[model samples]
Target chain A: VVYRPDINQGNYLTANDVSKIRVGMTQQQVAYALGTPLMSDPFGTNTWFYVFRQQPGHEGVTQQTLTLTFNSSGVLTNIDNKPALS
Target chain B: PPNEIYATAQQKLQDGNWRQAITQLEALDNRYPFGPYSQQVQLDLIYAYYKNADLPLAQAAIDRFIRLNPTHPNIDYVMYMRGLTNMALDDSALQGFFGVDRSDRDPQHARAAFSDFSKLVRGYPNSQYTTDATKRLVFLKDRLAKYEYSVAEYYTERGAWVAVVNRVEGMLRDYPDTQATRDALPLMENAYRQMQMNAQAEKVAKIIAANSS
Candidate 1:
């Protein structure tokens, strides 16, 4: 009688997707690699937060967060929460 | 007749006659598609399907119910059942009673269980099921980490140092504070040693030592 669709809220990054982010990539490049971040801190202009939360039918709830920091010139300085080598 | 059918189905379900209950519930669904007891029957069907060890069916029933009634008051229970279904996916009678070590197996179901439990924890943090869901999520995390470790071990044994490092690193980074981390640290150190990255190896060794102390 009733049906509920899966709920997907936020940016969803797979291991492969996060693996592509490398140091020194530009902010636009990082965005191209991992999509627009969920939030970019107003107080911390250099830090970008890519948070993903999804309730999939088979996979259940998948949540991943990726944080990227850029230098004043907007070159990506650091990437946090990158998936391991594999 | 819908009430009567629902009553009989409930009685059958209470008596542990899941098969009969399923039949009666199916009839109820057909006869009273949108009746007052519809939601109740759907929920009962999920439980009966689970009790009957029909995981796929049970999962499907739960999915349908949740999809149809996203705002249902008993959603927490349905979400709990979703987690339980995935939790029990690979738990055979022998595995349950004998404490078998199937940690090396594929962790798809365990991953699903973790996700389901996490959803319950995040969405219904105050629900009664939150505690149990959290516990199960922890267990599933360990199980998943072990699975990743096992795969990394396989790569290590095959002399695929790069792949091994990748997998082990994932275990360490993604599943910190798990027993798998304990297993992963040394493997990663060994992999680094084999790769002639002594500095990295020493760093990992220090971390391992620090954790141990």
Candidate 2:
């Protein structure tokens, strides 16, 4: 009951998620193939940010980040970062 | 001493003070909790857990008892209580209003109770508990069959007529004796009409009449 507690936040993407991302895939299609990102832009609206953070009650804190950019047409355009699983 | 606490557990149980009896039972320093009263103490502990609505623990204690004393004389009673404990969660089936909770999936506890009671009735045909055990078997089967019909209705609304017929047919085959099966006739007739099988629909209408009386 007194432990620091394991903390986890956001989508857990699997392998093959890289090809699941492609230029011209619609937002809905991208979200369907890849799980929904942990964060998204508000006004500019072109960037989808995915982050996985785990603090294993003891990992101190380890973080992974992926940033996806969609074109003005809302088609996925860039997969700037990828999370490598340990 | 495990001996001393065993005596106290008996006293607390005799007073119907089940929670503190739990305290005494678990506190009885584990190594057999001592001689003559050991098995009875274990049985009493399960009763206290069941009474306290500690079903998870009630289940655990029963599993341990079965593992340790599978041949105990009163095990039929334990098996019956196992059915009873699994029956505890089936109340969700009863509380729904005017045929509500219709879409709820198969009730886990009712299904477990169904298997549990059927085992006792099948294995211990003349057990002291079999009469009561058989009563639970009847109730759980009805609940289970009713749940099956609810899903068939779900398939009907979703326009999955083929799925409806197959599911409802299985329901009919398993629980033809149940009132739920009696109530389920129209859905199969409707599914047959939707699938345009026509023949089975008319036959179901005839069967419905035969079953009604």
Candidate 3:
């Protein structure tokens, strides 16, 4: 039997996080909205990727991801996707 | 539930669980930005951060409270922590202050401690914290002078007699009344004599005679 336990990694992007991070916000403003991004491989440049995964023991192979892109001025130009609930 | 969280965080604080209290206080701030217990939360954050030895975070939280609530009544306590935060940041500052040994250390945070403690004592004379801040300023002044003296000693050890004279003179000028000045004067006279400037050496002798403090 494969043993399983509750686990989580990276930024926990919750549902309400959507309204908080709209485009047209400065990178500084957006950072305040989203906290620190989970991964930025090559550790360079403009994109901030928020990735999180959860394996709930006997559970939702639940997972989430968000990618925010910014310009030279570091204004939030795009968000690739978002998260759940009211 | 902000109130409940505030109460829970305070419980952690009283229990000396600094690490957990920090997360709780942070959550309280986030979930209820500048709410009913916001002011107290700011104060608790600095204390918890300081206790956790998270010096920079402690310093930032102290400054944020001070700037945002500049004239608020509890500000004296914030300035009090301001002194402690900077006091804790520079490892160099305290090693020389306490050990008086093994230091090629700088006085950057020591000076900041001096600046803010001076402000705290002068501006809020009646504050409960001014008493400790006053003593801390005294301790930092002595260490700063000791560090300055060490700089000259550095020059002297390397046979840079000319720079030694310059270093000694600046220490004398900058920290004239510090106890370290007494040690600095003789070193200056010695530096002068080594460089064959007996005339300047005699002047330092006369200056020492007038050093009655």
Better of 1 and 2 by DockQ: 1
lDDT of 3 by residue, A1-86 (tens): 57566555456666686656667777676677678664442223556656555556566455455666666777756766534301
Candidate 2, residue A54: Cα displacement in angstroms equals 46
TM-score of 1: 0.61
After TM-score superposition, what is the CA distance of residue B33 in candidate 2 from its true location, in Å?
Answer: 3.7
Residue A1, model 3: lDDT of 56
Docking class of 3: incorrect
Best by DockQ: 1
- Taking the tens digit of each residue's C-alpha lDDT, what string does model 1 give over B1-213? 656774454364466743554566556566556677674564465666576578887666545755566776887776776666787775667777787887887777876776666677678648876766666667776777788878888866645555565576466457757887776767766755544223224545655445653
Q: Which candidate would rank higher by lDDT, 1 or 3?
A: 1
TM-score of each: 0.61, 0.57, 0.56
TM-score of chain A, all candidates: 0.64, 0.71, 0.72
TM-score of chain B of 2: 0.75
Candidate order by decreasing TM-score:
1, 2, 3
Off by over 4 Å in 1: A1-86, B2-23, B36-39, B42-44, B97-99, B207-213
Lowest lDDT sum, 10 consecutive residues, model 1 chain B, at B194-203
lDDT-wise, the better of 1 and 2 is 1
> Could you say which candidate leads in TM-score?
1
Docking class of 2: incorrect
Residues B128-198 of candidate 2: C-alpha lDDT, one tens digit per residue = 86766556577666777777777787777655554565577577556757877766767866744533223
Error of 1 at A6 (Å): 44
